[PDB]
Amino acid sequence: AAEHSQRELDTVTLEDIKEHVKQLEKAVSGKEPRFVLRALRMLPSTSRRLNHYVLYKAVQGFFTSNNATRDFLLPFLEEPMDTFRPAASTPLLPEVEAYLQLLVVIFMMNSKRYKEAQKISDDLMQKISTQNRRALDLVAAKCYYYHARVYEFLDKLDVVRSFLHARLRTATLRHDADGQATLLNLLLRNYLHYSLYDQAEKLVSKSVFPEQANNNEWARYLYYTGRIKAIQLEYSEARRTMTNALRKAPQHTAVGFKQTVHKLLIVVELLLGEIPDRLQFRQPSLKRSLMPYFLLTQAVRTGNLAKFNQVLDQFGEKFQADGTYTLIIRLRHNVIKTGVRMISLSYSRISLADIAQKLQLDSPEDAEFIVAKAIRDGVIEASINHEKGYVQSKEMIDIYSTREPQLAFHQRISFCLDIHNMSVKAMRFPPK
Amino acid sequence: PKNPDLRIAQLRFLLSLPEHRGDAAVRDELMAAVRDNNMAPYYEALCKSLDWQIDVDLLNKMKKANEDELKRLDEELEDAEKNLGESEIRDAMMAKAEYLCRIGDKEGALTAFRKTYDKTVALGHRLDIVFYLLRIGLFYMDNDLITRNTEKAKSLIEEGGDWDRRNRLKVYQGLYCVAIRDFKQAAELFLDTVSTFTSYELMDYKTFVTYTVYVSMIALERPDLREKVIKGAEILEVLHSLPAVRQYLFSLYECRYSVFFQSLAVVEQEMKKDWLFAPHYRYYVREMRIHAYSQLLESYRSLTLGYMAEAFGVGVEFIDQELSRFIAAGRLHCKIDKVNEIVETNRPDSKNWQYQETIKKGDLLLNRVQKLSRVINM
Amino acid sequence: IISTHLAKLYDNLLEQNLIRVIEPFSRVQIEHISSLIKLSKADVERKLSQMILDKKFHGILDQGEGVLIIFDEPPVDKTYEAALETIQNMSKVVDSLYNKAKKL
Amino acid sequence: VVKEMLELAKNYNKAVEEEDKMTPEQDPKRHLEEHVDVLMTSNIVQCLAAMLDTVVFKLI
């Protein structure tokens, strides 16, 4: 019974993978980029199945030119004892062989076997280092990404740095985008993983991300640079970038991604004084995962040092687990600035004695120093009158008749014009 | 069937500060027990208080005797006879509502009522269960079942008769209540239905009008609400019937905040004992404060805190504290000065508000279209 | 039926007096208007607050100094009224386009 | 023109909602488009002309 369903699923996966391979060949046919992302778009869904019989049948069907590269997977591959070329001996397209080796790697990967996957990924990159075809650049991006996924669980990311650097430079010379985006994201993860934040930041400043890169890679790069500038103290640009990335983040999947992004945007916001919205603490896929950070935010909004200390002592393992323990140190030291922020938003003017009373500062001079530091940054706009003691805020002039709407509208209309122009350029009429 | 919430909201679930754990409420519940004998209200009682008293089994004896007698009657008339459709089997189900629902649990009666729903065809039985397990989901806190019943009643059942689902907003009156559901549609159908009650099973008309007032003033502050709740006829008659809530409404309408605050405290206190209480009583009593404050700030440019206290009840210092925690929420647009003691209102004019709303709705649409243009054309 | 009716008439005639006067003025002290209208400060203050709150008389009260201000709201806002509603109209258009993308 | 754009956009939304339940088988879209074009030219010309009038027709 189970064998029958397994055979039917093997046949349907064989046909789907055959569709993928034919898609590679009619993508290499027509000499055009694209229609290969149509090939690689659903490798997660097909990699969901990845049975042994279908892989062996695909190997025996599309590697009819039996080479040593096919004879290296066979030792580790477990071929069925009892068990299709869609047919002559035409030499295999390098894109096709790279893709087939990719699925072989991914099957060998999902089965918790890492070392042989490490070697096989290494031999996949040693041959991909020889090809100079754009048809093997979009495929090569995903080969690189799944290769680094193979390597990640083997805890050997440092050795890959030289290879990723070399291939990123190769992509930049050839003006690659998908390979460039994947390599840049992966190498930023490499730098941050070994806590080389200075190195990653310096690399970021001299590297320009391609605007044509796919949405998910753009979101990854935005996340990486946002983390870099958040631990680099560029909080405003940090929150802007993570909000952008969450707008670009997938709605359904990437639960871990959205969880980490939510955690770091929460800490960045309350470091800047902004309070995260409660609704993001309510979705089931995020509720219990942010429950430590939810208690964090509860203590931050309450601001009591006792509950703050108990929350820290109870969740410090979670705080460092995301590389935010120093971040939460600065959080614990910026809650006072946050408090001053709502104090000044509520009050147009307030005596520093009243500041110390509402904030428990125990001194008017301490309140003066703290409020001066806070107003140094762009947290509060005011005009301190020490003649009498005023913290008189700037007159809230009419936003209209102030040229600010004109600038915002100019930026927005430029955005719409670029969107329209890119859309009209992307009409892409066919030949026949 | 089970009207007075079985007191379970106030009996031993409203203990501590309101202290209602043993009182005349216990006697009322045990009166609704000795007639229509119950061990279902004893579920939390077997754990907390009134667990294993002598009466629990000294009444168990003839409660079980009577209930086997009645279910045996239902059986013998269901098996010896072959009554079809709306039949003695339905009598078994409704008895088992007065019984096993009000003997031991709902679940078996859920099985029975679902089976008879598959058996019976007409809408009266399914609406009977709608309100049965609606009130059950008030007792045992079920909501997915209730909303399933409401969707069935409206979308597909409500192609013959009508007029009955309206008072079933009680569940929406307490579904999302702390958010939107204590009001809006929870008022517009109460306001739609207040003229024609016709649902004395669920609650008395007086309590219905009190609930209608409570949801109406939170739904509508002064968006010409006077045309619907103040100038309304039946509402005015029952407010003549209930002076307290009448004062509570008219004080807000007539800007008598000094007495409106006392009325708000009174309604909050009597409000802590309802199906309404647990979810949103904090939310209601904060939101009404917001509404009254913002009502005064409107038609006002800058106010001395002394007149703030004097004309809006009391509490110069209390008004700074409350108004501060409320502006910090972003609502009630006004900027306040210290010992100069000026409260400058900074509500944007319709033009600047329109510009801000443009920025917001634009940015949302631009985000959506940017995502679309990015997924499309790669 | 004559106490309520005459109370309503008294309120209405108070309103008519307060609009028929103050037309010459744009910024007049509440003391001046009360002495010209013969009410207490608190009662006339409450009446003016009620009048503006009912949007019967456009203005705003600066009790921080104790003055009534007068202005008008320009109706050019109709273009923005159209603009925002058209914005969410195109938003629903974009949602339908999103569904058409799901087709692809 | 913005009111006409309102009504044309409502018609566009309704037509596009029909489009999904429509395999290949006055469009609100075109009329919308020339309304957009006329608003474009009129408004941009008015803004630019007013600004040049600010510059060249100057007291100095």
Binding site: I413, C416, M427, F429 | - | - | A9, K29, H35
Partner: peptide, 30 residues
């Protein structure tokens, strides 16, 4: 906002229709 965003949405709508039309033409042709 009005005409420019409307034009952008219209252009995107014209885009996706072609992308379906091209996809449908390809499917009619494997």
């Amino acid at each position: 906002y009005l005409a420019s965003l409307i034009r952008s949405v219209v252009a995107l709508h014209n885009l996706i229709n072609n992308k379906i039309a091209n996809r449908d033409a390809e499917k009619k042709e494997g």
